Amino acid sequence: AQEKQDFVQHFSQIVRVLTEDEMGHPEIGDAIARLKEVLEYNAIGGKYNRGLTVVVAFRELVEPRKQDADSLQRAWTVGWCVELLQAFFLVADDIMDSSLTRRGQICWYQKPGVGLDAINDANLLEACIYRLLKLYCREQPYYLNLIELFLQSSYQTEIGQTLDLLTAPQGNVDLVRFTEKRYKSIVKYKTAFYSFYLPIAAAMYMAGIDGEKEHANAKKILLEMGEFFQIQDDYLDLFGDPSVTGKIGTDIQDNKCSWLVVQCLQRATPEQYQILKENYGQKEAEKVARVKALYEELDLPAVFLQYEEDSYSHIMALIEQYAAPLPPAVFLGLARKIY
Amino acid sequence: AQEKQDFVQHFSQIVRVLTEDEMGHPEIGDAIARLKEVLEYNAIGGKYNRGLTVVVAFRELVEPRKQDADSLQRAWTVGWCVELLQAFFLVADDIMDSSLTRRGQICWYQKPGVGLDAINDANLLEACIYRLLKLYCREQPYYLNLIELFLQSSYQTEIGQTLDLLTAPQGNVDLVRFTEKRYKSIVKYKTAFYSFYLPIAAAMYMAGIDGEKEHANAKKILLEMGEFFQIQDDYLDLFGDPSVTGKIGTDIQDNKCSWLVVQCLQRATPEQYQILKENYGQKEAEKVARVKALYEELDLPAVFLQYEEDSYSHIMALIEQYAAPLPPAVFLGLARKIY
Ligand SMILES: [Mg+2]
Ligand SMILES: [Mg+2]
Ligand SMILES: [Mg+2]
Ligand SMILES: [Mg+2]
Ligand SMILES: [Mg+2]
Ligand SMILES: [Mg+2]
């Protein structure tokens, strides 16, 4: 896009401000050096889809007369705050899941000499958000709105992550917990709210669009798009092409409440339920092959393609009905890239 | 005191509001049940010194005409927010230090079926603070002041905890890192700011006392009292009577940048430095006996008693000079209980 350029470049000033700006407090140098390393390792390396969304939406939503360099700089900073929310979640999630890599890189907590100290580094990444907001936006009228937005997004992501941990406890294989309401509930709180609501809502407040109806309306579209994003992600984990996706999938081995397995449990005969009690969550490849096979027997990819078409119409209907007074392009830009 | 009563009782409504109040969202019941268990296990069981300080100071600072039931209830809620900040730090710190117990109880993360999931429970306890503030204080004029106070206290505690992790890395025995400036720096950020500034400053904002000079002045007294509190705590860890303290100390075994060992390193001859390189951080009891012995050879407890008297005069001088326009009783209440 026309913006990715400026977005990554501005990370350097984000880092300058967060480290240079306690330079008149030398006794904390050594911890501020470490915060620089946490930031650099964890905030950089993604695609920045969520950060950039804030910027794109800011550009589509704020009257061009009010888009000076200072404004823009604030929008780039809020974008980065979304990225940092992200980095915080991911560093913590990787520790909890005992992950090895992320973005095909070694997980921060696995780096020699980091280990569980990453719990504190993860907290710091979260703290940094509110530092940047204060530094860049304290005089703006949407300041407190943004602060509350970021805290509510965290709470919701956390409540979502609880549901996820209660549903899929590693070692307590119980496919009984994997219902569709549960599934949709986890996605909503854990993924959709911060991934699809947070960034558009942030741009909105920056634009002065702060009414509860406007936000209720954007939220309806965006949680629905988040649910599709994640279902598509579950589907693609197994049936995607790794070269295209950049991802080699392991949902089955990791015991996930994937959409695929919810669907499968709704469509299994008892023999199949047991075939799935037998192979769900084994590293061994033939056990994994066996589950995939079961998924294909029951035409789950045809189910997915059907779901993908229905949901596309549904989102477009939602847009026609709830976008206004926002430009529909704000939503459709995102629909086009996810679909 | 005349208040402890009401403070613990009000925890029940804190819990009601944080769990009943998403009762019209059933799909998240099971996670809200878990949040209730996190709250109950981790927020209860301390002495509540920091929570109660908010309440005591609110009572000493707000004109009695403005202390209705609603006001008081808000002060009890902010007290609890300080307790929850606490609980958040402690649950996370125990995971990072691999602690077994706290408050002679099993650490939350060690409870069967919790483990590293406690990272998310700890984050939730933090989120709860901002939920309570919104629920109880959003219409008050000090709302945003409090929010910023709690976020800055966290950032500072975290930066402090970084310094601590960089200074005393478990397995990288290097007494070289344990200087006095370092020591004082860790205490300040890691302990004093949230333990002694946060609660008085919170009561201040609730009282309308929001000027930067007033807060700079309270901070001077309170960081100084925090430094004494912690030095006294380091001293008592080893030389305190466990029956009186309720604590059996293990700073030496756990490789701490204790005040005792900073002092010792300033007063060691090279033979002694090596005796301390030999015994600092061993579980084995005679190695511990050996370090204590070395501390007594160099009259560290006489050093401590001297420090305790000097610092007492110093705090009183600080109070005479920086309390106004607050009632000195706000500070002296706290001086009396710590000294
Ligand atoms: Mg994960
Ligand atoms: Mg996870
Ligand atoms: Mg996936
Ligand atoms: Mg500890
Ligand atoms: Mg610690
Ligand atoms: Mg101690």
Curated annotation (Swiss-Prot), chains A, B:
Its cofactor is Mg(2+). The modification N6-acetyllysine is found at K47, K277. Isopentenyl diphosphate binds at K47, R50, Q86, R103. Mg(2+) 1 binds at D93, D97. It is found in: Cytoplasm. Mg(2+) 2 binds at D93, D97. The keyword Metal-binding applies. Binds 2 Mg(2+) ions per subunit. Its main location: cytoplasm. This is Farnesyl pyrophosphate synthase. Belongs to the FPP/GGPP synthase family. Key enzyme in isoprenoid biosynthesis which catalyzes the formation of farnesyl diphosphate (FPP), a precursor for several classes of essential metabolites including sterols, dolichols, carotenoids, and ubiquinones. FPP also serves as substrate for protein farnesylation and geranylgeranylation. Catalyzes the sequential condensation of isopentenyl pyrophosphate with the allylic pyrophosphates, dimethylallyl pyrophosphate, and then with the resultant geranylpyrophosphate to the ultimate product farnesyl pyrophosphate. Pathway: Isoprenoid biosynthesis; farnesyl diphosphate biosynthesis; farnesyl diphosphate from geranyl diphosphate and isopentenyl diphosphate: step 1/1; Isoprenoid biosynthesis; geranyl diphosphate biosynthesis; geranyl diphosphate from dimethylallyl diphosphate and isopentenyl diphosphate: step 1/1. It catalyses: isopentenyl diphosphate + dimethylallyl diphosphate = (2E)-geranyl diphosphate + diphosphate; isopentenyl diphosphate + (2E)-geranyl diphosphate = (2E,6E)-farnesyl diphosphate + diphosphate. It is an enzyme of class 2 (transferase). Dimethylallyl diphosphate binds at R102, K190, T191, Q230, K247, K256. One of its GO terms (molecular function) is (2E,6E)-farnesyl diphosphate synthase activity. Keywords: Acetylation, Cholesterol biosynthesis, Cholesterol metabolism, Cytoplasm, Disease variant, Host-virus interaction, Hydroxylation, Isoprene biosynthesis, Lipid biosynthesis, Lipid metabolism, Magnesium, Metal-binding, Steroid biosynthesis, Steroid metabolism, Sterol biosynthesis, Sterol metabolism, Transferase. Its EC number is 2.5.1.10, 2.5.1.1. It is linked to Porokeratosis 9, multiple types: A form of porokeratosis, a disorder of faulty keratinization characterized by one or more atrophic patches surrounded by a distinctive hyperkeratotic ridgelike border called the cornoid lamella. The keratotic lesions can progress to overt cutaneous neoplasms, typically squamous cell carcinomas. Multiple clinical variants of porokeratosis are recognized, including porokeratosis of Mibelli, linear porokeratosis, disseminated superficial actinic porokeratosis, palmoplantar porokeratosis, and punctate porokeratosis. Coiled coil: none annotated. It comes from the Eukaryota.
